[PDB]
Tab-separated table of C-alpha atoms and ligand atoms in Angstrom:
chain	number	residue	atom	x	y	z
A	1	UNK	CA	26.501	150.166	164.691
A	2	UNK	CA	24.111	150.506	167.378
A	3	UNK	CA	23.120	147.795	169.541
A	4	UNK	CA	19.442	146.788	168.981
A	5	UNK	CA	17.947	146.292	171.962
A	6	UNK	CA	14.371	145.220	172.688
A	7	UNK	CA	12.994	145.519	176.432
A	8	UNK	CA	9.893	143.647	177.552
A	9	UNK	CA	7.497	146.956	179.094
A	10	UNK	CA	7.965	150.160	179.675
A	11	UNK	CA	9.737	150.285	182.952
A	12	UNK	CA	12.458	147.945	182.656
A	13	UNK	CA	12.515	150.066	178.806
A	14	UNK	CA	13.457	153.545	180.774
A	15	UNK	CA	16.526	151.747	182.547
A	16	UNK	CA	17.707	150.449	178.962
A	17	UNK	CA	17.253	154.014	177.573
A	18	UNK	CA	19.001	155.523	181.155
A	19	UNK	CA	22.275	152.926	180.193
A	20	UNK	CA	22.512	152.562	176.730
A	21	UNK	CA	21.876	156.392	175.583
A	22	UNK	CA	22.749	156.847	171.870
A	23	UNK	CA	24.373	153.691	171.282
A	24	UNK	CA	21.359	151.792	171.656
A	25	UNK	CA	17.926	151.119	169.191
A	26	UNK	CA	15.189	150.484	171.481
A	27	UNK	CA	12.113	148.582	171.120
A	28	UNK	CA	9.770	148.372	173.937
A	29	UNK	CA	7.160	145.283	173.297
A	30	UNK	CA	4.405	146.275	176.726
A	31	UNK	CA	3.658	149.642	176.404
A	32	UNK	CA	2.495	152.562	178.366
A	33	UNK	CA	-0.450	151.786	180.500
A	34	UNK	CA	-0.294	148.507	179.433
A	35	UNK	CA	-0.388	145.344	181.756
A	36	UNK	CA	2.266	142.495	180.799
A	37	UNK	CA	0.160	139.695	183.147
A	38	UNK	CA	-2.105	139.652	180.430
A	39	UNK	CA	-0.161	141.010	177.284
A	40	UNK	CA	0.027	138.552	174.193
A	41	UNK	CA	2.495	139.021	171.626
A	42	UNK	CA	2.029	140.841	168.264
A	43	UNK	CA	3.748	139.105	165.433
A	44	UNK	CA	5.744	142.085	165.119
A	45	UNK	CA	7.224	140.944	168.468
A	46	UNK	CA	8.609	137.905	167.038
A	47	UNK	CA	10.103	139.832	164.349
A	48	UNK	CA	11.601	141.945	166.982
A	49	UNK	CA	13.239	139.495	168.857
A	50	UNK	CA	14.429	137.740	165.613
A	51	UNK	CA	16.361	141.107	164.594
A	52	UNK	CA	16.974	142.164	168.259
A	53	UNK	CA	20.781	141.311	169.711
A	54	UNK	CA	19.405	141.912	173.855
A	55	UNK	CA	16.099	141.164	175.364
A	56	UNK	CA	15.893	142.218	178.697
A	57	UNK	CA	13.288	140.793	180.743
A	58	UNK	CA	12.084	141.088	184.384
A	59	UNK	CA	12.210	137.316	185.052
A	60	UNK	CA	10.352	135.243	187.656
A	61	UNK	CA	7.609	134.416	185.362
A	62	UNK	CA	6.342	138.360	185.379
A	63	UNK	CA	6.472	137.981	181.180
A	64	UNK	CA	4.527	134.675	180.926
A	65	UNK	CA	4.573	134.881	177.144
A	66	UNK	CA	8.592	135.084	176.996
A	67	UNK	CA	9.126	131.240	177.039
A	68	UNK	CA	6.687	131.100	173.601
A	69	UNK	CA	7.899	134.235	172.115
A	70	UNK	CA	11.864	133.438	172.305
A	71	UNK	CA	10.607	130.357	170.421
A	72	UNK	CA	8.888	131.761	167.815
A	73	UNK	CA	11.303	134.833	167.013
A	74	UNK	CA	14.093	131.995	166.482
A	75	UNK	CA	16.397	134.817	168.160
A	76	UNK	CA	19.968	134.186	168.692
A	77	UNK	CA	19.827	137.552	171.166
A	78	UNK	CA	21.616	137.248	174.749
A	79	UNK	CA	18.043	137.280	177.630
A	80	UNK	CA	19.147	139.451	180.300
A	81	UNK	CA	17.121	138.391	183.934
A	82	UNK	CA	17.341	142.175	185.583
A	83	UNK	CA	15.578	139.703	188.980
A	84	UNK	CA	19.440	138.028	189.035
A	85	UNK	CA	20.444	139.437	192.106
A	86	UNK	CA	17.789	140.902	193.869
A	87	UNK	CA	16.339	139.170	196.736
A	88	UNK	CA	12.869	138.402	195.826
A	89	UNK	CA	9.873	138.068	198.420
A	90	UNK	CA	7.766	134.737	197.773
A	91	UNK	CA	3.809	135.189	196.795
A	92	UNK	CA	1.331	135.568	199.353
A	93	UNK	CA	-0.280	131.714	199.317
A	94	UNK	CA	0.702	129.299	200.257
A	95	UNK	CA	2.590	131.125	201.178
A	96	UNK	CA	4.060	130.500	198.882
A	97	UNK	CA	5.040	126.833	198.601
A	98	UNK	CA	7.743	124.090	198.938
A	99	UNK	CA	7.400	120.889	198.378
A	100	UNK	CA	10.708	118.439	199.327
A	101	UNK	CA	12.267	116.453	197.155
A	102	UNK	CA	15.238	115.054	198.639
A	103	UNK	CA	15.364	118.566	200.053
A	104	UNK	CA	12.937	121.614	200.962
A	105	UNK	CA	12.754	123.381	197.252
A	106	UNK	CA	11.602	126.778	196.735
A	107	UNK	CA	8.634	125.614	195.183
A	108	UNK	CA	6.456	126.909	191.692
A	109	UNK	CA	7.406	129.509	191.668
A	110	UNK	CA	6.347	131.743	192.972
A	111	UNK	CA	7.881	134.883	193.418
A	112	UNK	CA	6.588	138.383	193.581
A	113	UNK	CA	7.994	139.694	190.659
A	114	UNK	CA	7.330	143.730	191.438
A	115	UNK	CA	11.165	143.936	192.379
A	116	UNK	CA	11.424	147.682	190.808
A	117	UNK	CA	8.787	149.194	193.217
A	118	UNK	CA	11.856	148.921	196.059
A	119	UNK	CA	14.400	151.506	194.622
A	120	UNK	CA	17.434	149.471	195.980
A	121	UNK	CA	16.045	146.808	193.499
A	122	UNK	CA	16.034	149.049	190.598
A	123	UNK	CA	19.456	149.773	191.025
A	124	UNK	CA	20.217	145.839	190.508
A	125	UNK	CA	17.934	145.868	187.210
A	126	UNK	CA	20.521	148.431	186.208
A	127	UNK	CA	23.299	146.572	186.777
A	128	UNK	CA	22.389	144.288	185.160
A	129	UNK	CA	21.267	146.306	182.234
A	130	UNK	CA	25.058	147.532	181.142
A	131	UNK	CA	26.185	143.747	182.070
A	132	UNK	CA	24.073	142.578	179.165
A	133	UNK	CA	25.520	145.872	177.207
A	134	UNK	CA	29.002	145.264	177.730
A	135	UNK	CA	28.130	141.470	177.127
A	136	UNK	CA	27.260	142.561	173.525
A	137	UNK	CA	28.999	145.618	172.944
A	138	UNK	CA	32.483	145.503	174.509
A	139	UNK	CA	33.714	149.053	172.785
A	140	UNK	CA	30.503	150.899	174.628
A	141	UNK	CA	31.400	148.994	178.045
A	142	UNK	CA	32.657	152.292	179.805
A	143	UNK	CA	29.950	154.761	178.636
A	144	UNK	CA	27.472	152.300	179.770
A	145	UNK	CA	29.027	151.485	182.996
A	146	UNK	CA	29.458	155.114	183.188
A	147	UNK	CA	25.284	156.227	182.375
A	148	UNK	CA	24.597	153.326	184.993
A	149	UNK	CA	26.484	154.565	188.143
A	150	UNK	CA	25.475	157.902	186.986
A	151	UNK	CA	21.466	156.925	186.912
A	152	UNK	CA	22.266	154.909	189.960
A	153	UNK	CA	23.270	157.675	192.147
A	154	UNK	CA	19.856	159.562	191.485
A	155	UNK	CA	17.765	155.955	192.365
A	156	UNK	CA	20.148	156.283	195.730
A	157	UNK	CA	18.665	160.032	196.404
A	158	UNK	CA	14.878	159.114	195.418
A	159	UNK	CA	15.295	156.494	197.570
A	160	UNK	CA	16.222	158.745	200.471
A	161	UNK	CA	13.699	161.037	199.409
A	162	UNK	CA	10.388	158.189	199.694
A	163	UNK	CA	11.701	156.826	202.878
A	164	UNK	CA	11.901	160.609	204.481
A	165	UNK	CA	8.820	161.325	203.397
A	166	UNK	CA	6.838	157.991	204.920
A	167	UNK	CA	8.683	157.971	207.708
A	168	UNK	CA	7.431	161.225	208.540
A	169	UNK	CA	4.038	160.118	208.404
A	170	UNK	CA	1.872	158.766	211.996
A	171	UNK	CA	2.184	155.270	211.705
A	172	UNK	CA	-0.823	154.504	212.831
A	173	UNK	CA	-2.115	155.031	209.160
A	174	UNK	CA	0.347	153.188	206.973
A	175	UNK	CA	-2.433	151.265	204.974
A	176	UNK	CA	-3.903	151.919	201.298
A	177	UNK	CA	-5.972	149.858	198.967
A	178	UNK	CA	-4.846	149.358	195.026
A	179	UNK	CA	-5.823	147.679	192.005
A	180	UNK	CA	-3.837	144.432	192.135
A	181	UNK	CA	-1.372	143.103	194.441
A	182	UNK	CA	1.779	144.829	193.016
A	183	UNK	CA	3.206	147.066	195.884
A	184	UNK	CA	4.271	144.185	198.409
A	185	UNK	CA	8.091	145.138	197.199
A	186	UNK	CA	7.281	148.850	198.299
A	187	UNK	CA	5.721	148.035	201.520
A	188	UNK	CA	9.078	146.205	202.556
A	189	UNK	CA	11.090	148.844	201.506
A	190	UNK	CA	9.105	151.989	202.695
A	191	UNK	CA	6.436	150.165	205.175
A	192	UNK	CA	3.185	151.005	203.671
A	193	UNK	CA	0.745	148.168	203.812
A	194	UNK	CA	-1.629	147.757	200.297
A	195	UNK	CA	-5.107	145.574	200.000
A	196	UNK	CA	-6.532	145.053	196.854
A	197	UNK	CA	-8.983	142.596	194.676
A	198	UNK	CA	-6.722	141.316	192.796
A	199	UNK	CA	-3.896	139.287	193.647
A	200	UNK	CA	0.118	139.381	192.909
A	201	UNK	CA	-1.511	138.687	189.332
A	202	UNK	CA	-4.332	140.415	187.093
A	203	UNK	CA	-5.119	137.261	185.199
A	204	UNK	CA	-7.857	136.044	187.425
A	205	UNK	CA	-10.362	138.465	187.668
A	206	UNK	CA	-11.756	139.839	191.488
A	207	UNK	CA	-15.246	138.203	192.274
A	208	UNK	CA	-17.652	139.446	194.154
A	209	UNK	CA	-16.635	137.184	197.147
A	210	UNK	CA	-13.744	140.047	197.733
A	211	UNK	CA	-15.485	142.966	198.172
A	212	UNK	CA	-17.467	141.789	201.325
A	213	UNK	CA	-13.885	140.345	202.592
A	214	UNK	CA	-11.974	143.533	201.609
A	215	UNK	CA	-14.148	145.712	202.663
A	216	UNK	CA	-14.034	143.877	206.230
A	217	UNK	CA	-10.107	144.102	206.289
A	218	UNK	CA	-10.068	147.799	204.848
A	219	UNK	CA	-11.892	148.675	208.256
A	220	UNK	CA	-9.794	146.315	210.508
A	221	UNK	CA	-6.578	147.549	209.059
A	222	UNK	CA	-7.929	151.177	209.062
A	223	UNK	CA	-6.933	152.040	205.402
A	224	UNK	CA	-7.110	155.319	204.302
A	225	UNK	CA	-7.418	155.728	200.486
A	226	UNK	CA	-8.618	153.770	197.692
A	227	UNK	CA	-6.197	154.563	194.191
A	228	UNK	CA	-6.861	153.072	191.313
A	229	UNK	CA	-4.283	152.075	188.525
A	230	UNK	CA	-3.019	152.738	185.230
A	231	UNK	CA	-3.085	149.236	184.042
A	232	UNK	CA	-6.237	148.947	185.235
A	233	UNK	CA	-9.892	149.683	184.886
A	234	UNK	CA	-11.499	151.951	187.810
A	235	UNK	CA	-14.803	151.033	187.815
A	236	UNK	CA	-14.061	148.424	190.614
A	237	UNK	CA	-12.558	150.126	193.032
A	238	UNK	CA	-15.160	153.271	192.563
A	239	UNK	CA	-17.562	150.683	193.967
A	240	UNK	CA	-15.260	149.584	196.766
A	241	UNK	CA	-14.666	153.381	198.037
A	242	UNK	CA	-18.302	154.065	198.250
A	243	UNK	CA	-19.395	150.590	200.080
A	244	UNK	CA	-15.968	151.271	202.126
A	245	UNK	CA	-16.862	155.202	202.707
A	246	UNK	CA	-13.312	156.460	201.551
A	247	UNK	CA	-11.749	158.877	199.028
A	248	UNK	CA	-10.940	158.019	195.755
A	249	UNK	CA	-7.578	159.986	195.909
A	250	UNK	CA	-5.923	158.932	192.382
A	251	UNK	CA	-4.278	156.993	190.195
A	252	UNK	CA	-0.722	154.963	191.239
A	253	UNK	CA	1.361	153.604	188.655
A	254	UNK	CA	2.345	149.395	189.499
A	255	UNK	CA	3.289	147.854	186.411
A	256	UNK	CA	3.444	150.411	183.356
A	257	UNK	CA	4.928	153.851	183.295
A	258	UNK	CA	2.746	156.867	182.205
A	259	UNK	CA	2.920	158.360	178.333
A	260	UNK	CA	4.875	161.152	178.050
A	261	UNK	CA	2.761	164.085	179.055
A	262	UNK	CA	1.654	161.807	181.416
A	263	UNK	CA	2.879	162.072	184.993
A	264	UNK	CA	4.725	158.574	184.931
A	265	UNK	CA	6.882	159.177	182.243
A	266	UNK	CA	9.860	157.605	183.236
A	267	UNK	CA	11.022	154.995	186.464
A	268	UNK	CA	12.250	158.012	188.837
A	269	UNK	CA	8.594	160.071	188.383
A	270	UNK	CA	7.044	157.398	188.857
A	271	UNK	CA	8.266	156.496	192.306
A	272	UNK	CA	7.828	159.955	193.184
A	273	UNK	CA	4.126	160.119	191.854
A	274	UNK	CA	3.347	157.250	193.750
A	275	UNK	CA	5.059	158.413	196.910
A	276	UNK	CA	3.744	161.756	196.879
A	277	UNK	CA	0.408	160.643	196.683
A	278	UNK	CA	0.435	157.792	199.086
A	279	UNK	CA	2.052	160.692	201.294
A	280	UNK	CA	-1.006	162.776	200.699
A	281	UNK	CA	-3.415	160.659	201.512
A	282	UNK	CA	-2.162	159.048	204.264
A	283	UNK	CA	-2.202	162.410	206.098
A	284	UNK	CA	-5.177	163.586	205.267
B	301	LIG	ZN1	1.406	143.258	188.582
């Protein structure tokens, strides 16, 4: 019978659906346009959990509610960490951490946790997507390590495809200005540098001691267009292209995908949304 699989948002849900195709029941718990910093668990999300036989989660402390939620679900399901593998960048401040015990430790924690938004990384959330699938599922094992180098081979081209594109832009404007601080994973990857409000996190909410600061280093750095984001709600950053004198030029997608209909519908048009119009603005 199909494996019942529940995925913690909507991103991380497309790679499930990419590897497990028909053999799989989804269950997506942070939806569309939804922002998982800040979600808090439905008790249908126990009951998920508590019928579910994989959770896949981001790791690095992106889900803080996991921890709790695993708990209260009693599940006996096999927690997938797609981070396992990648190599993560550490929080901006301070910068982040250490702290020795006997030894220099990695301190708490902190991790970026926006892995995806560097292709390369996706295709190690994949992997280990059809890991946890063959963990549970032996019989599917081949079709799923067969959808995964499959979906992995288009990541590889829309890779190619973002990198062409930026590095066919002057470098002398490489900068743009977001919601929160969820691209630092793309600027490594593709060399675009994002200021925002927020920080790595949407919990704390952006005083007004940031605007006078941003708008200081949004002149300084040169930056070129404000976006807002899906997770997010624009009124701020309105404020900040006016006071900053630049263009509004749209929406990028950090943490959520789009609905369908939407333009973010899945992983792969997402990139490429976000891409494209970075790659707009930046020349105009
Ligand atoms: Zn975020």
């Amino acid at each position: 019978e199909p494996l019942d699989v529940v995925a913690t948002f909507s991103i991380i849900g497309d790679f499930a659906a990419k590897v497990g195709g028909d053999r799989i029941r989804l269950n997506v718990l942070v939806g569309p346009d939804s922002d998982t910093h800040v979600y808090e668990p439905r008790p249908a999300d126990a009951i998920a959990l508590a019928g579910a036989d994989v959770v896949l989660t981001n790791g690095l402390e992106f889900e803080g509610f996991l921890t709790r939620l695993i708990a209260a679900s009693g599940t006996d399901a096999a927690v997938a960490t797609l981070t396992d593998g990648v190599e993560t960048m550490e929080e901006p401040g301070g910068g982040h951490y250490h702290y020795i015990d006997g030894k220099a430790v990695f301190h708490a924690g902190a991790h970026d946790p926006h892995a995806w938004q560097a292709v390369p990384n996706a295709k190690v959330y994949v992997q280990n997507i059809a890991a946890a699938f063959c963990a549970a599922d032996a019989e599917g094992c081949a079709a799923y390590q067969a959808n995964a180098a499959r979906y992995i081979g288009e990541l590889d081209a829309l890779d190619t495809e973002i990198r062409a594109a930026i590095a066919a832009l002057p470098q002398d404007r490489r900068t743009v200005v977001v919601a929160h601080n969820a691209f630092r994973y793309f600027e490594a990857a593709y060399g675009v540098h994002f200021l925002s409000p927020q920080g790595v996190s949407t919990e704390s909410e952006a005083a007004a001691a940031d605007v006078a600061g941003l708008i200081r280093e949004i002149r300084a750095r040169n930056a070129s267009a404000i976006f807002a984001e899906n997770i997010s709600d624009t009124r701020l950053l309105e404020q900040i292209a006016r006071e900053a004198g630049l263009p509004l030029a749209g929406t990028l997608y950090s943490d959520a995908l789009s609905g369908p209909d939407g333009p973010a519908s899945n992983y792969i048009a997402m990139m490429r949304h976000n891409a494209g119009a970075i790659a707009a603005a930046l020349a105009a």
